[PDB]
RNA sequence: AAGGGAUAACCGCUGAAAGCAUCUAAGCGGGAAGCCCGCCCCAAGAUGAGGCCUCCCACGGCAGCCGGUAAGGACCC
RNA sequence: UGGCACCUCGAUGUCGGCUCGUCGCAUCCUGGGGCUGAAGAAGGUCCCAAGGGUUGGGCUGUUCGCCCAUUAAAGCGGCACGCGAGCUGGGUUCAGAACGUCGUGAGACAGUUCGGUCUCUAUCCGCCACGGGCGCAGGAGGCUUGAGGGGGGCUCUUCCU
């Protein structure tokens, strides 16, 4: 049980797909 | 000149009265009989040792407080599945396991070591079924 | 330590001292003894009982012979009661007397491939508030990297039922020897028609 | 029974006993009975 | 200072034959086998049994005295006999004899009946006095102990099963 | 659960070293929802592959192969 | 709570909840005890004990906490502060908007506020189930021993005395 509030290290997914490539 | 290797040899059946013998120290000897390492033609890659019959295992002997304190242990694979069974109880329920489990541990691991174990025939009480093999008595 | 083969026929209830008594009815006798197990010969003690008659046209030769040797006409089913040596060469329901208490084994109804909820009364999912396609799913099954694996016996969906269940300490409410009927109070594994075993109870 | 890592006599009547690989202190006054732990 | 060295008077006529690991003591009250260390030597002189330690090593000095007393006791037992008396104090409490056996009445919702083990004789002179009589010292003090335990002496009241010659030490209650 | 058994802390019987005392060094008791067993279920791949009952049997040609069977078995319904 | 900066920045998804649990014991309860400034009942304190148990509701994202009604008890902790290829997404990382504050300004805040895309397909190990094959020195049909495992293990009220 940790008090010092634990910030996220990561952004909640997610934005966009690299569609397409052809 | 290449080292000698035995052709197939017919294995000697040896018999040992365990009564009153110091468990572990009997155990090392049985292993050497088992591996074949008393034989001058010993070869590490084949079952060329003796068949050892032990009798009177119930009457194995042991130093210190091991009767009450040595704990044989079995793991089931389940949660909370460690079984701790103390030497007293073991002898009290499957006395032949005591010497067996001692000897097992002092043979090699591997397939051959496992086969060597199969050549150890251990019994509680004075008598054993291998009359057919006319086992040779050993004092060790 | 008596026992007997029998088929489950059904339930009703009877009235006894102004009370409804749910009962299962079991056709028990008559079961001819067809082998005995002895410590000299077998290493332990029990009767092999036969039960329900069989068309000898269906009895293969190895079996016909076993029956033969025991001087007994063919039977559908053979099952041993353990540590029981009846005086006679036939066990019937007479060996139970109303008021005795017994245990009954039978084979439970199959439920087939059952989910975690029917099998193990898991709590399943929410059905709203956002629950995404998990409403009868088992939830988590594990930890993380430690221990990084799943327990043996982790409760899970699988086959369920069509197993041996022994239900214990049921009251014999009545026995009807004219018909080989046993009325045990309460409920017994298996479908009406299932085969059951009735043994004298161990709970004391 | 007092249980501690210092068991000693308390009164003149106290008596240190060593019993089954443990050090107790028995005495006629029950308050003084000690085991070590 | 020494118990092993003191000799054991053997009254006429109790037999004391010695075998390895035991001495057998027979007398007018019956017999008793005494298990004894192989390490000690039990010596039978005229109407005296003596015991001898092999050295002055700690184990032996300890084994020494114990051995004497055990044989010494066995002797006294098969001759004189051994006993402990139990007093019963407390108001409603009293004991009577049922056949061979002891029935205790001590404040419970029931009596407590006590079986004589092999070799023990219960005797209830008054109803508030019980006598544990036997040939085995150890066995007697045992059964005695047991009976007493059925209702120990209270800490506040003179009440419960007492040993004859047991000090009534009580404490205040308010 | 009952019940049996062995134990924990704890309480003891007998008892020296240490003439007294000591539950301990010899030995013996009592003592937990806990431990072993007992209950219920699985289980001989328990390759250490167990046991009992019954059935078939010495079939043709050159610890091997081929063919027709035996007791049984599978296929199909 | 920190220190350090050792794998991992060609990604180890992070609060809380839900679900499923499993373990430790420094035990909340229930069993067994010693001492008590223990008359009784009740309770203090320590020892043994992890088998089982350990409630429902209001507040708030909250964990925590407070509170209501109970209770034998309403235990504390570990498992990537267990568990997002299991769900959630209330909270804390983006883009919008506003308040207080700071900045001339663009903007900013371990402040506040409303809103804000969570990915059908399991190769392997692991797990739950079910078969196929071969083996168990002759081939067969039945019936079994149980090595070894697994399951279970709670507790209250009243009355008699
Ligand atoms: Mg040699
Ligand atoms: Mg070589
Ligand atoms: Mg055995
Ligand atoms: Mg190696
Ligand atoms: Mg059945
Ligand atoms: Mg179905
Ligand atoms: Mg399901
Ligand atoms: Mg269910
Ligand atoms: Mg349901
Ligand atoms: Mg629910
Ligand atoms: Mg639901
Ligand atoms: Mg919902
Ligand atoms: Mg969604
Ligand atoms: Mg849905
Ligand atoms: Mg691992
Ligand atoms: Mg099925
Ligand atoms: Mg009727
Ligand atoms: Mg039905
Ligand atoms: Mg101090
Ligand atoms: Mg002093
Ligand atoms: Mg004293
Ligand atoms: Mg003399
Ligand atoms: Mg001399
Ligand atoms: Mg019990
Ligand atoms: Mg006992
Ligand atoms: Mg004494
Ligand atoms: Mg002194
Ligand atoms: Mg001792
Ligand atoms: Mg005992
Ligand atoms: Mg003891
Ligand atoms: Mg006692
Ligand atoms: Mg219980
Ligand atoms: Mg089976
Ligand atoms: Mg079975
Ligand atoms: Mg088999
Ligand atoms: Mg194995
Ligand atoms: Mg077989
Ligand atoms: Mg740090
Ligand atoms: Mg680094
Ligand atoms: Mg870092
Ligand atoms: Mg780092
Ligand atoms: Mg990184
Ligand atoms: Mg990559
Ligand atoms: Mg990578
Ligand atoms: Mg990646
Ligand atoms: Mg990962
Ligand atoms: Mg992940
Ligand atoms: Mg937990
Ligand atoms: Mg735990
Ligand atoms: Mg503790
Ligand atoms: Mg308590
Ligand atoms: Mg207390
Ligand atoms: Mg009180
Ligand atoms: Mg008071
Ligand atoms: Mg008071
Ligand atoms: Mg204490
Ligand atoms: Mg204590
Ligand atoms: Mg617990
Ligand atoms: Mg727990
Ligand atoms: Mg709430
Ligand atoms: Mg409301
Ligand atoms: Mg809250
Ligand atoms: Mg709200
Ligand atoms: Mg907030
Ligand atoms: Mg708060
Ligand atoms: Mg209370
Ligand atoms: Mg709560
Ligand atoms: Mg995580
Ligand atoms: Mg956690
Ligand atoms: Mg987490
Ligand atoms: Mg998580
Ligand atoms: Mg997710
Ligand atoms: Mg989460
Ligand atoms: Mg995950
Ligand atoms: Mg993952
Ligand atoms: Mg899920
Ligand atoms: Mg919000
Ligand atoms: Mg949000
Ligand atoms: Mg925004
Ligand atoms: Mg605003
Ligand atoms: Mg402003
Ligand atoms: Mg500011
Ligand atoms: Mg400004
Ligand atoms: Mg300004
Ligand atoms: Mg910045
Ligand atoms: Mg909206
Ligand atoms: Mg927001
Ligand atoms: Mg997702
Ligand atoms: Mg979604
Ligand atoms: Mg796919
Ligand atoms: Mg796969
Ligand atoms: Mg893998
Ligand atoms: Mg198979
Ligand atoms: Mg198959
Ligand atoms: Mg069949
Ligand atoms: Mg057998
Ligand atoms: Mg078993
Ligand atoms: Mg295995
Ligand atoms: Zn003192």
């Amino acid at each position: 049980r940790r008090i010092r509030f634990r910030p996220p290290y990561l952004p909640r997914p997610g934005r966009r797909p690299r569609f397409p490539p052809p | 000149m290449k080292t000698y290797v035995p052709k197939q040899v017919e294995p000697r059946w040896v018999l040992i009265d365990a009564e009153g013998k110091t468990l572990g120290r009997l155990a090392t000897k049985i292993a050497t009989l088992l591996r074949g390492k008393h034989r001058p033609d010993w070869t590490p890659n084949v079952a060329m040792g003796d068949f050892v019959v032990v009798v009177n295992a119930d009457k194995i002997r042991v130093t210190g407080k091991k009767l009450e304190q040595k704990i044989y242990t079995r793991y089931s694979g389940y949660p909370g599945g460690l079984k701790k069974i103390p030497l007293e109880k073991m002898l009290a329920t499957h006395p032949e396991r005591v010497l067996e489990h001692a000897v097992k541990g002092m043979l090699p691991k591997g397939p051959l070591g496992r086969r060597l174990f199969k050549r150890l025939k251990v019994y509680a009480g004075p008598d054993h079924p291998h009359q057919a093999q006319r086992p040779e008595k050993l004092e060790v | 330590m008596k026992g007997i083969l029998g088929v489950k026929v059904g339930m009703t209830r009877i009235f006894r001292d102004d009370r409804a008594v749910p009962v299962t009815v079991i056709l028990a006798g008559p079961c001819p003894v067809v082998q005995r197990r002895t410590p000299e010969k077998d290493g332990y003690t029990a009767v092999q009982l036969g039960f329900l008659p069989q068309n000898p046209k269906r009895v293969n030769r190895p079996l016909k012979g076993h029956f033969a040797k025991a001087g007994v006409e063919p039977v559908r089913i053979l099952r041993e009661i353990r540590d029981f040596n009846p005086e006679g060469d036939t066990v019937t329901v007479e060996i139970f007397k109303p008021g005795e208490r017994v245990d009954v084994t039978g084979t439970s109804k199959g439920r087939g491939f059952a989910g975690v909820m029917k099998r193990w009364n898991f709590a399943g999912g929410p059905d709203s508030h956002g629950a995404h396609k998990i409403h009868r799913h088992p939830g988590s099954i594990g930890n993380r990297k430690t221990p990084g694996r799943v327990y043996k016996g982790k409760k899970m969906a699988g086959h369920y039922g069509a197993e041996r269940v022994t239900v214990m300490n049921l009251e014999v409410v009545d026995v009807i020897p004219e018909e080989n009927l046993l009325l045990v109070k309460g409920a017994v594994p298996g479908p009406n028609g299932g085969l059951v075993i009735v043994r004298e109870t161990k709970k004391a | 029974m007092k249980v501690r890592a210092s068991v000693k006599r308390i009164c003149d009547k106290c008596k240190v006993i060593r019993r089954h690989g443990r050090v107790y202190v028995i005495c006629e006054n029950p308050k003084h009975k000690q085991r070590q732990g | 200072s020494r118990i092993g060295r003191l000799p054991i008077p053997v009254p006429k006529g109790v037999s004391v034959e010695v075998a390895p690991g035991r001495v057998k003591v027979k007398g007018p009250k019956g017999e008793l086998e005494v298990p004894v260390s192989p390490e000690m030597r039990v010596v039978v002189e005229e109407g005296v049994v003596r015991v001898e330690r092999p050295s002055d090593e700690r184990r032996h000095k300890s084994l020494h005295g114990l051995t004497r007393t055990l044989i010494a006791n066995a002797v006294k037992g098969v001759s004189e006999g051994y006993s402990k008396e139990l007093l019963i104090k407390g108001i409603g409490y009293r004991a009577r004899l049922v056949g061979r056996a002891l029935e205790l009445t001590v404040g419970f919702s029931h009596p407590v009946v006590v079986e004589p083990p092999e070799g023990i004789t219960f005797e209830v002179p008054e109803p508030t006095r019980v006598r544990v009589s036997g040939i085995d010292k150890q066995k007697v003090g045992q059964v005695a102990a047991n009976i007493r335990a059925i209702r120990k002496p209270s800490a506040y009241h003179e009440k419960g099963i007492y040993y004859a010659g047991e000090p009534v030490r009580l404490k205040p209650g308010k």
Side-chain angles (χ1 to χ4, degrees), chain A residues 2-3 5-11 13-17 20-22, chain B, chain C residues 1-56 58-204, chain D, chain E residues 1-168 170-174:
Chain A
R2 292 78 158 309
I3 346 291
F5 139 78
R6 257 65 246 222
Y9 65 126
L10 275 196
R15 269 108 243 129
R16 129 269 137 232
Chain B
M1 58 144 359
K2 297 207 201 76
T3 290
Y4 171 74
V5 220
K7 288 284 135 73
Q8 180 88 356
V9 294
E10 250 259 41
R12 148 157 148 286
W13 287 58
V14 127
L15 167 143
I16 293 168
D17 191 343
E19 172 151 17
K21 291 182 165 307
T22 297
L23 169 59
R25 315 184 98 104
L26 165 52
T28 77
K29 295 193 203 72
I30 299 189
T32 350
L33 259 347
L34 259 355
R35 311 274 309 272
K37 254 165 50 209
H38 55 311
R39 290 179 39 103
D41 61 343
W42 170 84
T43 304
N45 59 339
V46 303
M48 45 80 71
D50 289 341
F51 275 75
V52 178
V53 168
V54 185
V55 260
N56 266 321
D58 25 301
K59 297 166 181 282
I60 204 66
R61 227 45 105 236
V62 118
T63 350
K65 344 246 265 274
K66 297 196 225 131
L67 228 70
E68 239 99 3
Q69 299 192 8
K70 186 189 183 65
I71 297 134
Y72 285 106
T73 181
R74 271 194 309 255
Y75 176 56
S76 87
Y78 284 63
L82 183 58
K83 225 147 190 163
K84 302 141 173 275
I85 313 149
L87 192 257
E88 260 172 357
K89 177 153 270 293
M90 183 62 58
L91 284 151
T93 39
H94 296 92
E96 57 294 324
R97 222 104 99 193
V98 171
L99 215 222
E100 277 184 352
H101 178 289
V103 168
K104 186 158 217 157
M106 312 182 175
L107 300 164
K109 295 318 180 225
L112 177 38
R114 246 173 271 140
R115 186 168 172 220
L116 301 201
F117 177 82
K118 297 192 198 182
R119 312 189 142 187
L120 175 68
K121 267 82 162 50
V122 164
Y123 298 90
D127 291 278
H128 79 79
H130 312 277
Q131 293 305 351
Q133 335 296 153
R134 287 152 101 178
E136 163 182 344
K137 195 133 195 327
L138 284 214
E139 303 304 317
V140 294
Chain C
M1 215 297 298
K2 38 185 170 168
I4 177 159
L5 305 187
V7 1
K8 179 190 186 152
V9 27
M11 305 195 63
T12 34
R13 50 173 189 195
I14 59 98
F15 285 110
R16 182 186 58 186
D17 311 328
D18 287 350
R19 302 176 138 257
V21 195
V23 297
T24 284
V25 192
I26 327 188
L27 186 89
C31 311
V33 347
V34 14
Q35 184 170 354
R36 280 165 233 243
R37 292 301 182 177
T38 64
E40 308 73 318
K41 193 60 165 307
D42 285 283
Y44 64 106
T45 351
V47 248
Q48 179 180 286
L49 269 22
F51 180 53
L52 302 162
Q54 169 60 340
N55 193 339
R58 296 180 186 145
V59 183
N60 70 21
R61 275 178 43 73
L63 271 186
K64 212 173 248 143
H66 179 141
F67 285 134
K69 173 156 183 181
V72 159
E73 61 285 84
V75 127
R76 268 202 119 166
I77 270 87
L78 234 59
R79 294 269 167 282
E80 299 186 11
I81 309 304
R82 172 99 187 242
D83 291 342
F84 174 26
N85 201 26
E87 260 253 271
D89 25 86
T90 286
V91 190
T92 73
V93 337
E94 299 277 26
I95 80 177
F96 292 114
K97 247 171 199 43
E100 291 200 69
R101 193 49 77 157
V102 297
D103 301 324
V104 191
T105 319
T107 302
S108 71
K109 282 173 165 182
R111 291 189 174 60
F113 195 135
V116 103
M117 293 180 76
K118 178 169 301 318
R119 254 251 248 196
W120 309 108
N121 322 121
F122 278 31
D127 306 64
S128 86
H129 279 308
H132 178 66
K133 299 157 76 175
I134 40 69
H135 320 263
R136 325 190 66 69
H137 271 259
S140 140
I141 70 170
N143 292 326
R144 245 236 243 197
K145 188 158 198 335
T146 307
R149 67 145 159 108
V150 182
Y151 308 150
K152 295 175 148 309
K154 187 89 202 49
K155 282 164 190 136
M156 281 179 140
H159 282 194
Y160 174 21
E163 269 315 323
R164 186 188 169 95
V165 185
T166 286
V167 163
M168 294 196 134
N169 213 53
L170 288 54
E171 167 186 324
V172 185
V173 164
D174 201 340
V175 1
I176 289 166
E178 32 275 355
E179 288 285 13
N180 283 284
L181 264 12
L182 209 14
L183 256 55
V184 75
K185 166 171 97 180
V188 200
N192 294 335
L195 182 136
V196 316
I197 293 185
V198 180
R199 279 169 283 92
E200 182 195 62
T201 185
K202 275 94 178 292
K203 303 298 206 184
Chain D
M1 164 120 41
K2 280 148 175 41
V3 221
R4 359 153 110 169
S6 192
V7 290
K8 321 166 93 162
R9 291 158 235 273
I10 283 144
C11 82
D12 69 295
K13 304 258 183 285
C14 288
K15 178 188 189 184
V16 177
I17 263 48
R18 176 174 179 94
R19 189 178 289 180
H20 305 134
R22 282 160 182 163
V23 178
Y24 304 80
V25 166
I26 27 159
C27 182
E28 73 198 4
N29 171 23
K31 282 208 182 163
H32 288 168
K33 188 161 46 173
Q34 316 160 35
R35 192 189 94 243
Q36 216 188 3
Chain E
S1 301
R2 184 95 231 83
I3 289 198
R5 89 174 60 111
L6 171 74
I8 304 172
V10 182
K12 313 169 101 152
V14 7
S15 68
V16 200
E17 66 154 312
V18 172
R22 53 207 195 302
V23 331
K24 198 167 199 181
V25 168
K26 309 201 190 74
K29 296 234 181 291
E31 48 166 324
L32 292 179
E33 276 229 13
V34 176
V36 174
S37 177
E39 315 204 40
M40 315 301 293
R41 179 174 308 97
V42 203
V43 156
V44 204
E45 302 174 344
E46 170 184 359
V48 161
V49 164
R50 250 202 312 102
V51 190
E52 280 179 357
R53 68 183 188 252
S55 82
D56 302 334
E57 296 170 16
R58 226 152 225 296
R59 163 170 50 94
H60 282 164
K61 289 156 72 185
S62 316
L63 268 172
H64 200 180
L66 163 76
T67 322
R68 180 195 168 258
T69 296
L70 247 71
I71 301 181
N73 278 342
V75 182
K76 160 170 220 299
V78 293
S79 61
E80 297 186 58
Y82 262 115
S83 114
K84 256 141 120 62
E85 267 186 27
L86 295 178
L87 282 166
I88 299 147
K89 291 166 162 296
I91 357 292
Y93 302 175
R94 99 197 72 182
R96 79 176 178 109
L97 216 33
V98 164
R100 268 208 55 73
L102 181 46
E103 165 175 300
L104 252 53
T105 274
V106 277
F108 295 117
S109 311
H110 51 117
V112 169
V113 147
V114 165
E115 283 312 322
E118 151 83 26
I120 292 289
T121 277
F122 296 162
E123 302 185 302
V124 200
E126 319 168 28
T128 113
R129 240 182 59 190
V130 155
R131 188 194 312 283
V132 219
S133 304
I135 122 188
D136 187 307
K137 179 178 208 145
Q138 195 284 329
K139 192 172 311 177
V140 180
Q142 179 62 84
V143 173
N146 296 353
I147 285 159
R148 198 183 94 102
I150 292 177
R151 177 66 81 178
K152 303 192 184 188
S154 168
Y156 289 104
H157 291 9
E158 195 175 322
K159 185 182 286 175
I161 292 157
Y162 286 72
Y163 274 142
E166 190 171 8
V168 160
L170 300 194
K171 63 199 304 180
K174 287 161 79 179

